[PDB]
Design a protein around this nucleic acid. Structure first.
Length: 546
DNA sequence: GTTGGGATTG
DNA sequence: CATTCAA
DNA sequence: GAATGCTCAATCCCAACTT
């Protein structure tokens, strides 16, 4: 869609280098400063060519796929990069990499004397020929008549280290700059300290890179024996880093449980503080026929549960373990009688998921039904509390592209922000919360945020929600979300219906045939019907006339 | 000729 | 989380 | 009662599939 400067991407890259120079100046090593300075020495076209290679996929390129008009002649622009070693000409290629660079026609002809196989695909061709050609070669040693040179980028690790230093993570690309400049991504602007940055110590960057590496190798099928040997056993000082580690241990354990190695899964879950891990360790011990440990851990956990999810899970585990130890059957109570509404509806032909069906059936004159499912309540929260969620609390925002503060999932996130929350939530006690939300809605429309789904929240659903929802219910929900954000942001009922005449609402969780209530949904039903909130669960059967 | 997936571009 | 498994 | 399969559209290139 034509940004006016043909070098827009190079401009952005220079912006990141400068930014890292001022904010990270104390964290950079010798190789890094040499890279930034050397890059500043490059002629514009070689700078541009570099950034082009960095932003594309993989490290290997054919000269002809590197044509660009701002740069002109590619060979000329690449020569200064060859002199620094940041690009190899004539690298050494594994057969698979040769297969990445080459067309299937060229490859079919090249090895034609070893192909009697069949007409068959490219990946199969690679498979058949790999036991034949294990030894890597330069491109010239593969075929000497191939007339297009091939370049390999050699600085990608140092670039990824720069990316992660600027963004505080590796998932965000440099195209963040162009997508925000084009208005495809619109981020809220925070004014944060000129000393604000993602990483404090160099070793914390080093560690993020090590965990990231570990996840990569695991995803490639590496045995956990050397994976675990490589991880640190001791927990990290930096807590947000210990989150990454602890998540990784968690997935290792899940993989183990899949392999039915229950003792190791238990071990790995037990050394992780990841939310829900203790539960998975009890359940793993039970699966490993280790009942006494499972029971012990379950009693430990029930003394001081981590979450409501953990309370609910122990409620099933404990009695089954008690039974497995031959302990007396302990009396319990029935579920709090979910308030249910049965519907027998036409068979659609064709589907038409069931939630749309109930939503149609419940919509009459006078009744408005919306398929929202925790997007409306979270949105109302994010609108009211916007000014606290985006507060300039130090270390919460270090660059223009945050969709959420960095500490959003930290334990004292609310404490750090305390006043500003009881300010915002306070507007629920006077009348001002409606106006405040409508203005925040108009001001902030489209801005990326953790809790506000704008696509879902049209002006009409906003107005009906505002005038039909009690403020005290809003406060109840909003405090429940704040208490544990990541465990409570999901599970609200599929539908919500409004009767704007009498300003009334009811939420409806929809369940088709073969559908049952998840755990979080059940906790939200319990929470709602302890407030005498209007929730109902709707179970649907289909009618086929024959 | 003709789709369809993935890399690329702004 | 929406399909499969267990009596 | 429980075990498990990081968001844009428009465009260009290359593999696969028709007769």
């Amino acid at each position: 869609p034509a940004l006016p400067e043909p070098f827009y991407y190079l401009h952005n890259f220079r912006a990141v280098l400068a930014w890292i120079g001022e904010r990270y100046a104390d964290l950079l090593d010798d190789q890094e400063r040499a890279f930034i300075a050397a890059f500043a020495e490059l002629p514009e076209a070689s700078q541009a060519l570099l950034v082009r290679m960095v932003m594309r996929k993989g490290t290997l390129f054919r000269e002809g796929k590197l044509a660009y008009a701002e740069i002109g002649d590619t060979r000329a622009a690449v020569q200064p990069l060859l002199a620094l070693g940041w690009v190899d000409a004539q690298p050494t290629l594994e057969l698979a990499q040769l297969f990445g660079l080459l067309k299937k026609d060229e490859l079919s002809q090249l090895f034609r004397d070893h192909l009697g196989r069949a007409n068959l695909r490219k990946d199969a061709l690679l498979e058949r020929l790999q036991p034949l050609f294990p030894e890597a070669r330069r491109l010239a040693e593969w075929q000497a008549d191939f007339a297009e040179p091939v370049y390999e980028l050699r600085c990608m690790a140092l670039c990824d280290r720069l990316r992660l230093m600027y963004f505080g993570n590796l998932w965000q690309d440099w195209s963040e700059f162009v997508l925000a400049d084009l208005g495809i991504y619109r981020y809220e602007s925070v004014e944060f300290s000129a000393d604000s940055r993602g990483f404090r110590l160099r070793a914390d960057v080093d560690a993020y890179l090590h965990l990231f590496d570990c996840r990569q190798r695991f995803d490639l099928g590496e045995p956990l024996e050397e994976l675990l040997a490589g991880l640190p056993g001791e927990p990290y000082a930096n807590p947000w880093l210990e989150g990454r580690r602890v998540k990784l241990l968690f997935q290792f354990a899940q993989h183990c449980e899949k392999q039915r190695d229950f003792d190791l899964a238990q071990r790995l879950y037990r050394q992780s503080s990841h939310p829900g891990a203790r539960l998975r360790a009890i359940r793993s011990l039970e699966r490993g026929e280790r009942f006494a440990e499972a029971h012990a851990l379950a009693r430990e956990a029930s003394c001081a549960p981590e979450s409501d999810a953990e309370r609910q899970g122990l409620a099933r585990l404990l009695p089954r373990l008690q039974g497995k130890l031959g302990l007396p059957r302990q009396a319990r109570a029935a579920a709090p009688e979910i308030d249910r509404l049965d519907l027998c509806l036409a068979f659609p032909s064709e589907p038409c998921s069931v939630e749309w069906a109930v939503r149609e059936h419940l919509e009459e004159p006078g009744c408005a039904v919306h398929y929202v499912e925790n997007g409306l309540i979270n949105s109302l929260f994010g609108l009211l509390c916007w000014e606290a969620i985006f507060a300039a609390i130090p270390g919460a925002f270090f660059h223009p592209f945050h969709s959420a503060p960095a500490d959003l999932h930290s334990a004292d996130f609310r404490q750090r922000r305390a006043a500003l929350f009881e300010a915002c939530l306070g507007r629920l006690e006077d009348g001002s919360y409606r106006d405040a939300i409508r203005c925040r809605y108009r001001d902030k429309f489209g801005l990326q945020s953790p809790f506000v789904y704008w696509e879902l929240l049209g002006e009409e659903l906003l107005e009906q929600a505002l005038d039909c929802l009690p403020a005290a219910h809003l406060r109840a929900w909003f405090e429940r979300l704040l208490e544990d954000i990541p465990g409570n942001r999901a599970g609200l009922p599929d539908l919500i219906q409004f009767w704007p005449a009498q300003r009334r609402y009811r939420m409806v969780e929809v369940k088709g045939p073969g559908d049952r209530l998840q755990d979080n949904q059940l906790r939200w039903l319990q929470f709602c019907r302890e407030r005498e909130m209007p929730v109902a669960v709707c179970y649907v059967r289909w009618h086929v006339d024959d």
